[PDB]
Design a protein around this nucleic acid. Structure first.
Length: 49
DNA sequence: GTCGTTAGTTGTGGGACTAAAGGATATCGTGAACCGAAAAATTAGTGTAACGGGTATCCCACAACGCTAG
Protein backbone atom coordinates (compact mmCIF):
# COMPACT_ATOMS: atom_id res chain seq x y z
CA UNK A 1 0.00 0.00 0.00
CA UNK A 2 2.95 2.34 0.60
CA UNK A 3 4.46 4.40 -2.23
CA UNK A 4 5.94 7.27 -0.21
CA UNK A 5 9.66 6.99 0.47
CA UNK A 6 9.01 7.75 4.17
CA UNK A 7 8.63 4.18 5.41
CA UNK A 8 11.15 2.18 7.44
CA UNK A 9 11.20 -1.46 8.62
CA UNK A 10 9.91 -0.40 12.04
CA UNK A 11 6.55 0.94 10.83
CA UNK A 12 6.11 -2.29 8.85
CA UNK A 13 6.01 -4.65 11.85
CA UNK A 14 3.15 -5.44 14.24
CA UNK A 15 4.00 -7.06 17.57
CA UNK A 16 0.34 -7.86 18.18
CA UNK A 17 0.12 -10.46 15.42
CA UNK A 18 2.84 -12.56 17.09
CA UNK A 19 1.94 -11.92 20.73
CA UNK A 20 -1.64 -12.95 19.93
CA UNK A 21 -0.69 -16.39 18.63
CA UNK A 22 1.80 -17.06 21.41
CA UNK A 23 -0.58 -15.95 24.17
CA UNK A 24 -3.42 -17.96 22.63
CA UNK A 25 -1.21 -21.05 22.64
CA UNK A 26 -0.18 -20.50 26.25
CA UNK A 27 -3.69 -19.69 27.44
CA UNK A 28 -6.17 -21.88 25.56
CA UNK A 29 -4.35 -24.88 24.09
CA UNK A 30 -5.16 -28.24 25.66
CA UNK A 31 -1.43 -28.99 25.89
CA UNK A 32 -0.66 -25.81 27.87
CA UNK A 33 -1.90 -27.36 31.09
CA UNK A 34 -2.21 -26.15 34.66
CA UNK A 35 0.76 -27.76 36.39
CA UNK A 36 0.18 -30.36 39.10
CA UNK A 37 1.77 -28.43 41.96
CA UNK A 38 0.67 -30.60 44.89
CA UNK A 39 4.14 -31.99 45.64
CA UNK A 40 7.50 -32.17 43.83
CA UNK A 41 6.65 -35.62 42.48
CA UNK A 42 3.49 -34.22 40.87
CA UNK A 43 5.53 -31.56 39.06
CA UNK A 44 8.18 -34.03 37.95
CA UNK A 45 5.48 -36.35 36.62
CA UNK A 46 3.50 -33.64 34.82
CA UNK A 47 6.68 -32.37 33.15
CA UNK A 48 7.36 -35.92 31.88
CA UNK A 49 3.82 -36.60 30.65
C1' DG B 1 -35.45 -56.40 -29.50
C1' DT B 2 -37.17 -53.28 -26.00
C1' DC B 3 -39.33 -51.35 -21.70
C1' DG B 4 -41.05 -51.49 -16.76
C1' DT B 5 -40.30 -54.19 -12.13
C1' DT B 6 -38.31 -56.25 -8.21
C1' DA B 7 -34.87 -57.42 -5.00
C1' DG B 8 -30.41 -56.90 -3.29
C1' DT B 9 -26.79 -54.20 -2.74
C1' DT B 10 -24.04 -49.58 -2.14
C1' DG B 11 -23.11 -44.98 -0.84
C1' DT B 12 -24.67 -41.50 2.01
C1' DG B 13 -27.06 -39.08 5.82
C1' DG B 14 -29.04 -38.51 10.61
C1' DG B 15 -28.92 -40.06 15.63
C1' DA B 16 -27.31 -42.49 20.39
C1' DC B 17 -22.86 -42.88 23.55
C1' DT B 18 -23.74 -43.88 33.44
C1' DA B 19 -23.95 -41.32 37.52
C1' DA B 20 -21.32 -37.48 41.77
C1' DA B 21 -17.77 -33.13 41.65
C1' DG B 22 -15.79 -28.66 39.06
C1' DG B 23 -16.13 -24.92 35.88
C1' DA B 24 -9.59 -20.70 34.96
C1' DT B 25 -8.63 -19.43 29.87
C1' DA B 26 -7.76 -15.39 24.50
C1' DT B 27 -9.27 -13.59 21.08
C1' DC B 28 -4.45 -9.68 14.25
C1' DG B 29 -4.79 -7.14 9.92
C1' DT B 30 -6.26 0.53 9.78
C1' DG B 31 -8.23 4.94 4.88
C1' DA B 32 -8.96 10.23 5.13
C1' DA B 33 -11.58 14.18 5.86
C1' DC B 34 -15.49 17.17 7.08
C1' DC B 35 -19.96 17.94 9.24
C1' DG B 36 -23.32 17.37 12.70
C1' DA B 37 -24.87 16.36 17.26
C1' DA B 38 -25.52 17.22 22.17
C1' DA B 39 -23.47 17.45 26.43
C1' DA B 40 -21.00 20.27 29.27
C1' DA B 41 -19.23 24.99 31.74
C1' DT B 42 -19.06 29.65 32.20
C1' DT B 43 -21.18 33.92 33.05
C1' DA B 44 -24.85 37.61 34.57
C1' DG B 45 -28.09 39.21 37.81
C1' DT B 46 -30.47 40.92 43.38
C1' DG B 47 -29.70 42.51 49.23
C1' DT B 48 -33.38 44.59 56.13
C1' DA B 49 -34.62 46.32 61.29
C1' DA B 50 -37.80 47.82 64.62
C1' DC B 51 -41.83 49.40 65.49
C1' DG B 52 -47.90 50.41 68.11
C1' DG B 53 -51.35 47.62 70.57
C1' DG B 54 -53.03 42.92 71.59
C1' DT B 55 -52.61 38.28 72.51
C1' DA B 56 -51.08 32.96 71.85
C1' DT B 57 -47.52 30.20 74.33
C1' DC B 58 -43.28 29.18 77.57
C1' DC B 59 -40.47 29.31 82.53
C1' DC B 60 -40.61 30.81 87.35
C1' DA B 61 -42.29 32.18 91.97
C1' DC B 62 -46.05 32.40 95.34
C1' DA B 63 -50.83 31.56 97.59
C1' DA B 64 -54.68 28.93 98.80
C1' DC B 65 -55.20 33.06 107.51
C1' DG B 66 -56.76 33.05 111.91
C1' DC B 67 -59.01 35.79 115.70
C1' DT B 68 -62.35 39.35 118.02
C1' DA B 69 -66.17 42.36 118.40
C1' DG B 70 -70.99 44.41 117.10
Amino acid sequence: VRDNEVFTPIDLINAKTLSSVINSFFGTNQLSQFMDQTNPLAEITHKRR
